[model samples]
Target: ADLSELLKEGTKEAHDRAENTQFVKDFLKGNIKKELFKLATTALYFTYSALEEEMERNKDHPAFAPLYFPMELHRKEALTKDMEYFFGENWEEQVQCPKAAQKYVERIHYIGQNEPELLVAHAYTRYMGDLSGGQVLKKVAQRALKLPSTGEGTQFYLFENVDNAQQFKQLYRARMNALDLNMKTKERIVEEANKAFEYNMQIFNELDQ
Candidate 1:
């Protein structure tokens, strides 16, 4: 089976559950409180930092090339800006990576360094979501939090070079389906992508608690 198709098929239920979480519903409806949004940005800070670090570390690996389209995909720097805006200039001191985010980061690093082919799953999950549902989240977040459209608070969703998100997502999926990985490897990637959704749900659940 085509890897991109498999990724979509395997992760749909997990993805739906993640999108339908109480916190996510709150976010989509612009009901997410400022403090809660800050908590999310804090959690996202650690998640992106680890994911981007792996991107930088593994950029040269052959398995990583098909998905390394990092021209406008990196989030670490944007997350730092959001962190400062939400948690103060001394944001690092005020925020801690929730336990769920910490585990999510570890999972990124583990697959990144060892079974690097699996990085595609994590990238597909986070980046595709960002390019897709993440735009909805961005609009709700900006309106709810009263953030400026062109500045620090909105940076995470404001991709720099992507002129059309739908077109870019099509290109991204084309790349995924074209990767040199075999069927077995592709199956493993699907499994990991599902886990990415699970990890995300757990993090949202943590926020609920």
Candidate 2:
């Protein structure tokens, strides 16, 4: 199967598991409090930090070169802005990675440093979701937090470069399916995508507690 089809078919169960968790339900319903949202943002900031660093580090890799979306999809700066808004100017000092989030960060760093090819899986799981249903999440957060329409606290869901999210995602999937990876490599990436969802669900499970 094509990588795009493989990714969609493979990650569906994992995606459902992550999104259907109690914390996620509360989150989408705007039933969560500011504190929980802040904590979630902190975890995301750290997670994306690891992921983007790996992307930059591995951009030259044969497997990574074809899939790099640095210009259009790089998110560290955006996450930083949201972090500052949520955690104040000294956000770095106030941030703490929950256990699941910490583990997620470690895993991202590990893949970046040791198995750079696997970074594609993380990118597929994260950036794709961000462009898709994450729009719904943006609305949920704004309503729940009573945030202004200025998108101050919810910048994470806004892809400034993506004039049309659906179109951009189609282009992203085309690139994904066109990569020069072998079948085994593709399978491994699919497996890692599932793990990414599990890691995400783990973070939400902890937050729900």
Candidate 3:
């Protein structure tokens, strides 16, 4: 089986659990206040910062090279702009990475530094979800927070370089499937993907509190 299919099947339960988390349910219902939304955005900033930095570090590795789509999918810059808008020019000083988000960041760094091949699992969990359900979350946040239609605060969801999200996701899946991974490695990657979802759920639960 293709790695993509394995990951999709393996992570389905984790995905469902993440979706049913109180924070995600509330966000989907457009119940997120600006403060919570800003905190959520801050968590995203730290996460992508670690993930992208590790991707950059491992861009030449065979395991991660084929999947590096920095221009099309990187979110750190957009999240930075959103942080500035929400927290003002000194946003760097104002923003803080919550405990759960720090744990996620640490895990990404560990994988990137010690197990770069598994980095794809984190990327797949995050960027694919950004292209998929993230669109709905974007609109919900925009409406709930009364953000500008000009795409000021929610730029993290905007993939300006990719003309079509569905096409891009297909390309990403193909890239993932093309990796020369054995069955054991593929299973490990799927397990890592589920871990990524659990990390995400922890972040959400923290935000909900």
- Model 3, stretches more than 4 Å misplaced? none
TM per model?
A: 0.95, 0.96, 0.98
Instruction: Encode model 3's per-residue lDDT on 104-194: one tens digit a residue.
Output: 9999999999999999999999999898766787788889999998888999998889888999999999988999999999999999999
Candidate 1 vs candidate 3: the TM-score winner is 3
> lDDT by residue for model 1 over 87-192, one digit each (tens)?
7788787778899899999999998889888888898889888886657677788899888876657788878778888899998888888778878898999999
List runs of model 1 lying over 4 Å from the truth.
none
Query: Which candidate tops TM-score?
Result: 3
Q: What do the candidate models score in CA lDDT, each in turn? A: 0.85, 0.88, 0.93
Summarize candidate 2's per-residue lDDT along 1-209 as a digit string, tens digits: 89888888999999999989999888867799999999888888889988988998888888787878887888888989998898889989887889989999999999889888889899989998888877889999999899889998898888888888899999888888888888999999999999999999999999998
What TM-score does candidate 2 reach?
0.96
Error of 2 at 149 (Å): 1.4
* The candidate that achieves the highest lDDT relative to the unseen native structure: 3
Worst 10 residues of 3 by lDDT: 132-141
